[PDB]
Write a protein that binds this ligand. Structure first.
Ligand SMILES: N=C(N)c1cc(-c2cccc(NC(=O)C3(Oc4ccccc4)CCOCC3)c2)cs1
Ligand SMILES: N=C(N)c1cc(-c2cccc(NC(=O)C3(Oc4ccccc4)CCOCC3)c2)cs1
Lengths: 5, 236, 236, 5
């Protein structure tokens, strides 16, 4: 999965 | 208000203790109680709220993904019918996730966003609103999926518009908003080109503003810039 | 019986799904429902029950330890009074932990232990009973602490007596029972010499019986033997 | 902490 913050 | 009888300051203190103990459900309940006291949230308090619910829903999302994967395999051509249990339990976790998202969205709508006038608070909450509609979109399949997607897009877009007018390109909230809106484009809206363009433009505009920052601000901004680069590397 | 309307087999299936999803509270609730169907548990089912509650109470214990540490520091000579909140929240987690332990102990008492006639089931449940009284002992401070300690000791001792009569020294349940009873001696009963003697004798007697085992049984027994050695290295 | 299983 891609990075989120 | 299950927390209605506890002091606001005590709720915030206990949220911090819950964080140290990695008790994120408790932390979220404490911060929901704090929000329901009706006062605006400070910067630290906004982040306690966000950390708590991000961790709770993050665990739910991870579990949902495991169960959805098992469910799809049980539905392949060649699988042995394992009855309704996988679907039922995936639905159970999904309903609990939707409930947490609805709770957070309810706090933002009653009345955090409408009282948020400063860019740092308003952009923060609108980012949250896009994030929790995005989580709802990840599990949505009915007559409402398009509307949930548009609700996420609309919240992210208002946040982006404010952030470009009111914050520098290295502001960590602006950077994290763009990171997440870029993931929305890639994973939810089936717009990978928009996702890549947004990540790249955000990264480049931040790079050019790093010279204005202190060492501590530089560390924060470059951290999120590295996440933008990580995603771009995943996608290209 | 919140799970009273679900099939036993469906509860067991969902416990396995919950395990894969790392949803151990759910897993424990499913397995409590299965126990409450009234039938004896198979080997696999006993371990689903144990894994679920061990993970739930393990997380509670870790949180309690964090909070108790914070609380003791707030009580040192030089600390700034931070009101009742740390104590209150430590008490909250403690009460929830005690509740989970009481639930498990209740399942063992109604009626898993009394129907367990085979060594592998009876020793397994009596080990569990010692373990959950041990967890209660870790937080106990009142008129009952000695009695809780003696309840743990008594359960472990009955389990040990059966295991030495009925199982080989490499049996993994026998090994894990001895590992945990040794930790009980060291950490709860203030008997480090008993803890060390038990770990060493268990290890040596297992070593001498490894020659009888298949490769798979050897792997299981030597795994727990390494835990015995790890503890001995910590304690000497 | 010591190991238990
Ligand atoms: N957890 C706690 N007890 C506390 C946390 C804070 C606090 C204080 C200031 C900023 C932040 N964070 C952010 O503004 C965002 O996160 C990052 C910021 C910089 C680098 C990486 C992430 C939020 C997510 O969108 C991106 C910006 C948190 C005070 S207390
Ligand atoms: N989790 C799941 N879905 C399943 C687990 C099982 C299963 C099957 C056989 C044995 C065990 N385990 C044990 O008998 C004890 O654990 C160990 C055993 C050997 C080595 C290390 C630990 C329990 C704790 O006391 C020590 C013995 C579990 C079937 S399904």
């Amino acid at each position: 999965f891609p990075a989120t913050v | 208000g299950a927390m209605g009888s506890m002091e606001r300051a005590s709720l915030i203190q206990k949220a911090k203790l819950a964080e140290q103990a990695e008790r994120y459900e408790d932390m979220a309940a404490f911060m929901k109680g704090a929000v329901e006291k009706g006062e605006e949230l400070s910067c630290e308090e906004r982040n306690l709220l966000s950390v708590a619910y991000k961790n709770v829903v993050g665990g739910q999302r991870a579990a949902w993904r495991v169960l959805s994967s098992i469910e799809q395999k049980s539905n392949e051509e060649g699988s042995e019918e394992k009855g309704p249990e996988v679907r039922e339990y995936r639905e159970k976790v999904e309903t609990e996730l939707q409930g947490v998202c609805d709770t957070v969205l309810g706090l933002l709508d009653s009345h955090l966003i409408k009282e948020a006038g400063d860019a740092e608070s308003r952009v923060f909450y609108l980012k949250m609103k896009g994030d929790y509609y995005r989580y709802l979109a990840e599990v949505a399949t009915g007559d409402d999926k398009k509307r949930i997607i548009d609700s996420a897009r609309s919240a992210y877009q208002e946040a982006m518009d404010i952030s470009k007018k009111e914050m520098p390109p290295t502001n960590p909230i602006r950077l994290g908003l763009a990171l997440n809106f870029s993931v929305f484009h890639y994973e939810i809206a089936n717009s990978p080109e928009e996702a890549i363009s947004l990540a790249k433009t955000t990264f480049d505009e931040a790079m050019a503003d790093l010279h204005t920052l202190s060492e501590d601000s530089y560390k924060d901004s470059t951290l999120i810039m590295q996440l933008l680069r990580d995603n771009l590397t995943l996608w290209t």
